[PDB]
């Protein structure tokens, strides 16, 4: 039984675009039906890393449940997670991806964070996250209280360190910012570690899955 994504792109649906809780939560599917021009995807402009690969890996799925990998009310006691954006406006009001959280400063501080997750779900777990690129150093200080920031995601197959590139861009959907999106499959048994002192667009929900 095929999976309709409506007017959404795989990016939007999987990120949790606000115009994307839309839909009939399904547990399994064979192939995926998506418009060539999907209108609601990366509501906040930016590059989705290894997008074509992800669309293949998701093309065929036998089990699929969403679950809250890093719970909003206990994971981030030293960081602000309330921020929302008019770039992700649902029904008129500002909002954000349901599967991510925009961490920003709290009490004038953005403490070094490191939070980890061990896969205990006996299925591959798809983990998504973003990194924010502000267009100037004024924004950078305002959101994260640090001029030089890093994000580091590390598992047994994944190891990358992002530094945000800060400079002028063209406006897409009235935004100068970019968020770059990233994803890794987390094998049952592996542990993924996020470390950052700024710019992390943190995962909130993730997905357990299988492919036949």
């Amino acid at each position, epitope marked *: 039984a095929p999976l309709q994504l409506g007017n959404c792109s795989v990016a939007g649906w999987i990120l949790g675009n606000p115009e994307c809780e839309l839909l009939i939560s399904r547990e399994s599917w064979s192939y995926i039906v998506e418009k060539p021009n999907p209108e609601n995807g990366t509501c906040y402009p930016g590059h989705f890393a290894d997008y074509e690969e992800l669309r293949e890996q998701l093309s065929s799925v036998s089990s699929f449940e969403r679950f809250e990998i890093f719970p909003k009310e206990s994971s981030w006691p030293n960081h602000t997670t309330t921020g*929302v954006s008019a770039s992700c406006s649902h029904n008129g009001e500002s909002s954000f991806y349901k599967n991510l959280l*925009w961490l*920003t400063g709290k009490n004038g501080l953005y403490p070094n964070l490191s939070k980890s997750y061990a896969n205990n779900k006996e299925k591959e777990v798809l983990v998504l996250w973003g990194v924010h690129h502000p267009p100037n150093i*004024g*924004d950078q200080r305002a959101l994260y209280h640090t001029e030089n920031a890093y994000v580091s995601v590390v598992s047994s197959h994944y190891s990358r360190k992002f530094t945000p590139e800060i400079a002028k861009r063209p406006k897409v959907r009235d935004q100068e910012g970019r968020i770059n999106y990233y994803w890794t499959l987390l094998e049952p048994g592996d542990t993924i570690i996020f470390e950052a002192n700024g710019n992390l667009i943190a995962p909130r929900y993730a997905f357990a899955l299988s492919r036949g």
Partner: single-chain antibody
Amino acid sequence: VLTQPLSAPGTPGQRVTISCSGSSSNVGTNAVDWYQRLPGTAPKLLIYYNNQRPSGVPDRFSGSKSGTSASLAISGLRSEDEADYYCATWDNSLNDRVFGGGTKLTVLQVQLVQSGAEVRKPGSSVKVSCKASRGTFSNHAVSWVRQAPGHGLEWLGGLIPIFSTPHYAQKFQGRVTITADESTNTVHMELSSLRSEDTAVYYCAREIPGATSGPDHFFFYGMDVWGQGTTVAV
């Protein structure tokens, strides 16, 4: 909400300091602004981003912030300093702009043009407009603020310069509509289902952005330029 001492004495020359105490949802984490309001005139931005003076402000005004409490400091205290001082910031959890109750101090370029100072019966609605010149609402948030006579400042809401999306303070959602016609460089506040509770002077103000690329609330770091006010009576 922000607690201010209700009153503050001062004598010329001497240095006086207003204080503003908040929760962490506000003040604690977000930038704090201070406004001064003399009578008849419009409120004036003294300090934004905790400690920044906008141009045209004497070295006499200084601002600081520590933990959950900010402070406005006047050092050479003229007589023309006698006015109401307000204290402002964003509050997460409320997700709104939020004003101090006010302190009365007692002793011993872009332009916005609001229009339509007018009268109305209860139950009706009003549409105030605000036109820009030698400047724009293109890369700036605009705020609407009212003051009921013998009351403090009160944020009705704002316009974020991304898809022209409105943002309505809790107390007002459902009654307020804010819109823009950018061809005419004007912003419009329409308040409906009026009542005497709403008779006030209404103001339109442009916000200094703390960040243009972040969550909405970083657009509102300080109202530096104000309309003239529009009086509305019910």
